[PDB]
Design a protein around this ligand. Structure first.
Ligand code: NAP
Ligand code: SF4
Lengths: 208, 152, 114, 80, 111, 385, 306
């Protein structure tokens, strides 16, 4: 249209529309939704029964190398009736292509972990346990990383408030550094920022 | 007495002439102190030597941001110091914990644990106001040891 | 429930597991009290152990108790070794905290109904 | 080797505990159907044989004894 | 050459027939799978595409072209794992249809 | 076996990273370190801020990078907003984006050479480093931590100067890198201090998910610097170093040649900059100028509202990564559709680069282990991802 | 008036003033007063550095430091002009080389029985001792009971507190024992007749003040501090060497902070289990502490494990 607008391309939008299509064709057992992003990204929605073999299928091939496990993350979504959302991100070395794996779950239902499939998930997989409580299956060493020793909260979900309950202080009553209920000097004034009038036409909801 | 009070103009001068500091590198306020060690604003030989073992310290410096996993380890090193000690904390995250201040796991203040004497403000204090804080500290030593047991 | 469990199946692989590590705590309470160099009586520690197990006895559903098993076992990893430097073990006892009133006439003179 | 030898050792375990049992050192204190305890406190009864006379308690038999006869009986086949 | 570029492997040893066994090693195991999934339809397609250009021509350097892997010893590893891939295709069953459809509104993004 | 925790010791380096050592007499064979000394509550904290207001908390994520961080954020936001940045602005993001690599690759050698215990190459190079912070103060706002890159391109134009200064600076730097060549390369003892240490070269050197150096310098040729573009970054000419074997001394010799590339690129970038503007013109993202927000009516309503709330970002997930001077830099920025973003999960190096210390360490001494760590160039506060 | 929880950063209404407060007793009392939160006004005598370890108890703005001598008047008046209550605990052992040491328990409690009382304070509380009697023993033990009556003329209702001997961490009486590494460990004086007094525990001391500080109605009705169960024995001296297994002084050393072979040695061996008709501790409840549990803490010698 003009300068100062991102020039999109169609070549990568073509092959990523082409490549991911016959992925669901050759495993119609686990794949439940595939979508192409408008900027050359791919999602393969997978029910977590096939958490191991689909990775194991992308672990090796002759048309898809994909042996660079970059990113394990975790996203919570309340009001979904199955809250959490484990999302991978893996890289083909020989092909320069990004693709993500979106696998939902719930809290108490475990997930067969990727421990034999990848050995870069040694510290990433434990993190979701410490922050959410998503108990992955058959991990050789589940422990506590990046949190303090006495928490019971799994803080990165939404019901855990901004401060905890555990504002710490010292006294010379004997020697100890003792815990106490939390007390702030200031509210953290919470604003109200959502302007009305719906700046977006394309993502318009079903109007019910 | 003119005879006895003349003596503490040597001893309370001698302690403000040789300070052997510890530094706790934790966050981005550690890096700027290294440039004070770099010989532009050469920190050595203006009264004060470089790094030193944890035993032989007088002036401890907390720099950066404290977490609850470090609140026990701070007090234990603070016990092992000898008696005429002083605590001086640089960095705006050692005075109220900067921002990160409303977070669930950051020590609010670095004052509810140790008693600190001189507060330098700022995300990084630019190794320009920090020598000014140290000359403030030697200016703070105008105290006396005589006319304390000579009074009471 | 269309969901697979963690370890137990129904209440009988469960309730034998909560009894199981109780002995591991029970020989641990005299073991650590001379180790972490703190000074209370050792029977207070055995009272606080059974304090924790008995309070959560209002569960009639598996894999939640089993979820507490993983929580209960992970406590012993720092405990048998030395990963709680003389504070976290003292954190179990609300010692220097002022007492909550918990009485209606006592609440009424102090507080806007907390 | 005396089968009376493990009879004395078992029958001052229970009253050495200062809890529930009011000098009922009888062989028929049938443990929460006669004697009356907590579900956890049964496991603490089994505990004092590792140090007194020495004993392992390897298996689910601690969930099986339920009477101080069978405690002697499970040490009976253990010993003689 | 004595170093294979990519450090961690060794030129071990002979091209043109170490490969030629391992393609044909897969094709015999490939026939074992029941043919309803298109996994056979593409995997047997590319191996016959590969082995036709593999067998049997000089040199090692010419075989690098028209066979888009790394060096030729690493092209072993391109199909080494693929032999370990296809034998586990008998163990689980991807040719079976879909299982556990999500409850009808989950993959909608704006809450 | 003795279970010493040589870590919390404030023995120079960086008094942190407290770990265990189940050493088998003299060899280690088991190392299980602990992290979490600074967790800081970062990823939870951003969930209440807006886009422009949350921006310096990316800056304080390293200790060193000031323009390579926030390079991984605006480029992670401008894709969502359908904007290419204006062409004068792209020549500055490559200039300061190829000047922070002349801060890591000075600090990544000297601080490694201080744990080892050499004194004089620590003072011989930071005294030359002072000639470079005068740039940061002259252009943006402060000593180090500069909220300078915005989502609307560059904040403001660099003033008169800074072109006969950088050319003055960069024409006298290769003599200083020829100093440390005499200090460490031709020396034998430091070579004897690091040869065949940390030989990790197999496909588990990539199955551990490592980013660059402690990659390609050990073998596998790949980088994000000429297979994936950023800005005007492919229109310059350079090469990428590869070492011979898979040890630390053949990932050390990447960094000498790496600094010999950033001098070429700066001396190539200065010849090609056109005059132009700074910000994006459509002003739903960039603020208007100060001489404009005092005259017209249209300027204030697209000024006063643009600071109460932020932008209007469309929904849909996104992801990117760029070359941090020690690795990749993953940002999986979940957008919701308002002025305040949703989840913002970051991947920093050190998750891979220090979990693989278990493989790398064993079979070796205890004095080896401190010499291992200063080769990966691990900075804490950055392992807070 | 109070507000919210008194965990920290509250108001709680009260505004106290604690003199002395540099020794073992006066420090540990205030460490409760900055927990519930109030305007604690502590003036110190001549010591800027010796209050450094005190500050991290009051949160922020709650404590304040001033200078005063005591023989001056307005320095004891300018500070106390805005408060509600005031306690005092000032005093020490042996006579100074410059002071007078008699009127310090007479005119110095009178110096704050000055316009201080007239200014509008209430619930003024002084300290006593259980053994301070008008009898001819001792030079320090008596002349404390002189202040108990001659200054009792002023402040007609006070509830002056009367403690027994105290044991805590860094006192003098219990640390007089086991600091006797010597060529002979002799008791006082090779006899098990009168030993011992009533060692009340230090948490009970600081708990008695905070209950009485808004009790109400505790003025004039003076109180006594019960000790442990029950009198005590000679076994205490043997109890030391059994389980132990046998601050602004100067720049080098103080020339005279001695063991004082004078009337120091008799001020403790004069037990005087006094009148039980004082209410005085259990009614100001609740204080119940044994000795056998708190003895591990304060004693510290070379074994440290077994
Ligand atoms: N309850 C008991 O068992 C017991 C036992 C022995 C003594 N006492 C007496 O009860 C109180 C307990 O004191 P403590 O155990 O904490 O030891 P302490 O060191 O005597 O504390 C009392 C404070 O009074 C200060 N002081 C002494 N003379 C002073 C003067 N002329 N002017 C101003 N301040 C003076 C002292 O030093 P500064 O001048 O530096 O402030 C000290 O800080 C004292 O009065 C003590 O004589 C009680
Ligand atoms: S905010 Fe200040 S104290 Fe915190 S990391 Fe940055 S410079 Fe250091």
């Amino acid at each position: 249209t003009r300068p100062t607008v991102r020039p999109r391309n169609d070549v990568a939008h073509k092959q990523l529309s082409a490549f991911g299509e016959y992925v669901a064709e050759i495993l119609p057992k686990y794949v439940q939704q595939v979508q192409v992003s408008c900027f050359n990204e791919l999602e393969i929605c997978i029910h977590p029964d096939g958490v191991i073999p689909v990775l194991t299928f992308l672990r090796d091939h002759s048309n898809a190398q994909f042996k660079s496990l970059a990113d394990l993350t975790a996203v919570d979504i309340p009001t979904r009736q199955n809250r959490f959302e484990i999302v991978y991100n893996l890289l083909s070395l020989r092909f320069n292509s990004r693709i993500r794996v979106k696998t939902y779950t719930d809290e108490l239902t475990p997930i067969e972990s990727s421990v034999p499939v990848y050995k870069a998930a040694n510290w990433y997989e434990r993190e979701i346990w410490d922050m959410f409580g998503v108990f992955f299956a058959n991990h050789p060493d589940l422990r506590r990383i990046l949190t303090d020793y006495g928490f019971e909260g799994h803080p990165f979900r939404k019901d855990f408030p901004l401060s905890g309950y555990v504002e710490l202080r010292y006294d010379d009553e004997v020697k100890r550094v003792v815990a106490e209920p939390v007390e702030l000097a200031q509210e953290f004034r919470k604003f109200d920022l959502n302007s009305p009038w719906e700046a977006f036409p394309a993502y318009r909801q079903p109007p019910e | 007495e003119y005879v006895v009070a003349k003596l503490d103009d040597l001893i309370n001068w001698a302690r403000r002439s040789s300070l052997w500091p510890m530094t706790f590198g934790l966050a981005c306020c550690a890096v700027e102190m290294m440039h004070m060690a770099a010989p532009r604003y050469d920190m050595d030989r203006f009264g004060v030597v470089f790094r030193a073992s944890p035993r032989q310290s007088d002036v401890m410096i907390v720099a950066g941001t404290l977490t609850n996993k470090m609140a026990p380890a701070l007090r234990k090193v603070y016990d092992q110091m000898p008696e005429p000690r002083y605590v001086v904390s640089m960095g705006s995250c050692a005075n109220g914990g900067g921002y990160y201040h409303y977070s669930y796991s950051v020590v609010r203040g670095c004052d509810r644990i140790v008693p600190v004497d001189i507060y330098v403000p700022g995300c990084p204090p630019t190794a320009e106001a920090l020598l000014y804080g140290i000359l403030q500290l030697q200016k703070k030593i105008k105290r006396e040891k005589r006319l304390r047991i000579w009074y009471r | 429930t269309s969901v697979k469990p963690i370890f137990s199946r129904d209440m009988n692989e469960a309730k034998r597991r909560v009894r199981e590590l109780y002995r591991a705590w029970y020989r641990e309470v005299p073991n650590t009290v001379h180790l972490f160099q703190l000074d209370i009586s050792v029977k207070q520690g055995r009272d606080k152990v059974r304090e924790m197990f008995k309070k959560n006895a209002h569960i009639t559903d598996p894999r939640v108790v089993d979820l507490l098993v993983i929580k209960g076992k992970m406590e012993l990893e720092e405990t048998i070794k030395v990963w709680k430097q003389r504070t976290h073990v003292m954190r179990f006892f609300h010692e220097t905290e002022a007492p909550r009133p918990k009485d209606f006439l006592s609440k009424f003179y102090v507080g806007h109904d907390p | 080797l005396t089968l009376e030898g493990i009879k004395d050792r078992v029958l001052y375990v229970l009253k050495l505990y200062d809890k529930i049992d009011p000098e009922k050192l009888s062989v028929n204190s049938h443990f929460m159907k006669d004697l009356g305890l907590d579900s956890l406190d049964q496991v603490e009864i089994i505990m004092a044989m590792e140090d007194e006379f020495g004993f392992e308690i390897p298996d689910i038999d601690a969930e099986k004894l339920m009477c101080p006869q069978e405690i002697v009986d499970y040490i009976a086949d253990k010993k003689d | 050459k004595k170093t294979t570029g990519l450090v961690g492997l060794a030129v071990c040893e002979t091209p043109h027939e170490r490969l030629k066994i391992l393609y044909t090693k897969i094709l015999d195991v490939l026939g074992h799978i029941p043919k309803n999934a298109a996994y056979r339809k593409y995997t047997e397609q590319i191996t016959n595409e590969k082995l036709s250009m593999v067998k049997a021509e000089p040199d090692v350097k010419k075989l690098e072209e028209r066979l888009q892997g790394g060096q030729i010893e690493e092209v072993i590893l391109q199909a080494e794992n693929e032999l370990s891939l296809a034998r586990k295709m008998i163990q689980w069953k991807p040719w079976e249809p879909l299982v556990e459809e999500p409850p009808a509104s989950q993959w909608k993004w704006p809450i | 076996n003795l279970t010493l925790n040589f870590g919390p010791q404030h023995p120079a380096a960086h008094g942190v990273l407290r770990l265990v050592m189940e050493l088998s007499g003299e060899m280690v064979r088991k190392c299980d370190p602990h992290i979490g000394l600074l967790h800081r509550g970062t990823e939870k904290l951003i969930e209440y801020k807006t886009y422009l207001q949350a921006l310096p908390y990316f800056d304080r994520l390293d200790y060193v990078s000031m323009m390579c961080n926030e390079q991984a954020y605006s480029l992670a936001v401008e894709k969502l907003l359908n904007i290419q940045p204006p062409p004068r602005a792209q020549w500055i993001r490559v200039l300061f984006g190829e000047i922070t690599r002349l801060l890591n690759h000075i600090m990544a050698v000297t601080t490694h050479a201080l744990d080892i215990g050499a004194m004089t190459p620590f003072f011989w190079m930071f005294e030359e480093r002072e000639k470079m912070f005068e740039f940061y103060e002259r252009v943006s706002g402060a000593r180090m931590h500069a909220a300078y890159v915005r989502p609307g391109g560059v904040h403001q134009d660099l003033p008169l100067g800074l072109m006969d200064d950088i050319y003055e600076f960069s024409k006298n730097f290769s003599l200083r890198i020829d100093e440390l060549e005499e200090m460490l390369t031709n020396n034998r003892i430091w070579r004897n201090r690091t040869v065949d240490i940390g030989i990790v070269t197999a496909e588990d050197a990539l199955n551990y998910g490592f980013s660059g150096v402690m990659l390609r310098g050990s073998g596998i040729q790949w980088d994000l610097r000429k297979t994936q573009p950023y800005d005007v970054y492919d229109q310059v000419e350079f090469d990428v170093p590869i070492g011979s074997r898979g040890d630390c001394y053949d990932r050390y010799l990447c960094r000498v040649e790496e600094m010999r590339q950033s001098i070429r690129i700066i001396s190539q970038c200065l010849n090609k900059m056109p005059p132009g503007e700074i910000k994006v013109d459509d002003a739903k993202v960039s603020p208007p100028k100060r001489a404009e927000m005092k005259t017209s009516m249209e300027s204030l309503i697209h000024h006063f509202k643009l600071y109460t709330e932020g932008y209007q970002v469309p929904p849909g997930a996104t992801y990117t990564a760029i070359e941090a001077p020690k690795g990749e830099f993953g940002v999986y920025l979940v957008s919701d559709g308002s002025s305040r973003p949703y989840r913002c999960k970051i991947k920093a190096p050190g998750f891979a680069h220090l979990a693989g210390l278990d493989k790398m360490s064993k079979g070796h001494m205890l004095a080896d282990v401190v010499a291992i760590i200063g080769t990966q160039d691990i900075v804490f506060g950055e392992v807070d991802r | 008036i109070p507000h919210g929880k008194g965990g920290r950063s509250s108001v709680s209404g009260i505004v106290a003033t604690v003199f002395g407060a540099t020794g073992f007793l006066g420090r540990y009392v205030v460490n409760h007063l900055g927990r519930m939160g109030s305007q604690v006004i502590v003036p110190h005598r001549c010591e800027p550095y010796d209050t450094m370890h005190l500050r991290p108890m009051g949160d922020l703005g709650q404590i304040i430091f001033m200078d005063w001598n005591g023989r001056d008047k307005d320095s004891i008046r300018r500070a106390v002009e805005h408060s509600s209550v005031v306690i005092n605990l000032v005093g020490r052992e042996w006579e100074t080389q410059n002071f007078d040491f008699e009127d310090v328990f007479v005119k110095i409690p009178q110096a704050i029985a000055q316009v201080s009382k007239e200014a509008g304070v209430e619930k003024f509380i002084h300290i006593s001792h259980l053994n301070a009697d008008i009898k001819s023993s001792s030079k320090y033990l008596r002349s404390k009971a002189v202040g108990e009556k001659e200054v009792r003329e002023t402040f007609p209702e006070a509830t002056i507190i009367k403690p027994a001997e105290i044991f805590g961490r860094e006192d003098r009486f219990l640390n007089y024992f086991a600091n006797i590494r010597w060529f002979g460990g002799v008791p006082l004086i090779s006899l098990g007749k009168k030993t011992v007094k009533q060692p009340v525990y230090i948490v009970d001391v600081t708990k008695g003040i905070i209950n009485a500080i808004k009790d109400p109605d505790a003025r004039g009705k003076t109180f006594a501090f019960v000790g442990p169960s029950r009198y005590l024995l000679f076994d205490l001296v043997q109890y030391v060497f059994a389980v132990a297994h046998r601050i602004g002084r100067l720049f080098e050393i103080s020339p005279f902070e001695p063991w004082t072979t004078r009337d120091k040695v008799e001020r403790i061996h004069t037990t005087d289990k006094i009148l039980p008709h004082l209410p005085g501790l259990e009614d100001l409840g609740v204080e119940a502490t044994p000795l056998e549990l708190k003895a591990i803490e304060v004693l510290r010698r070379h074994r440290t494990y077994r």
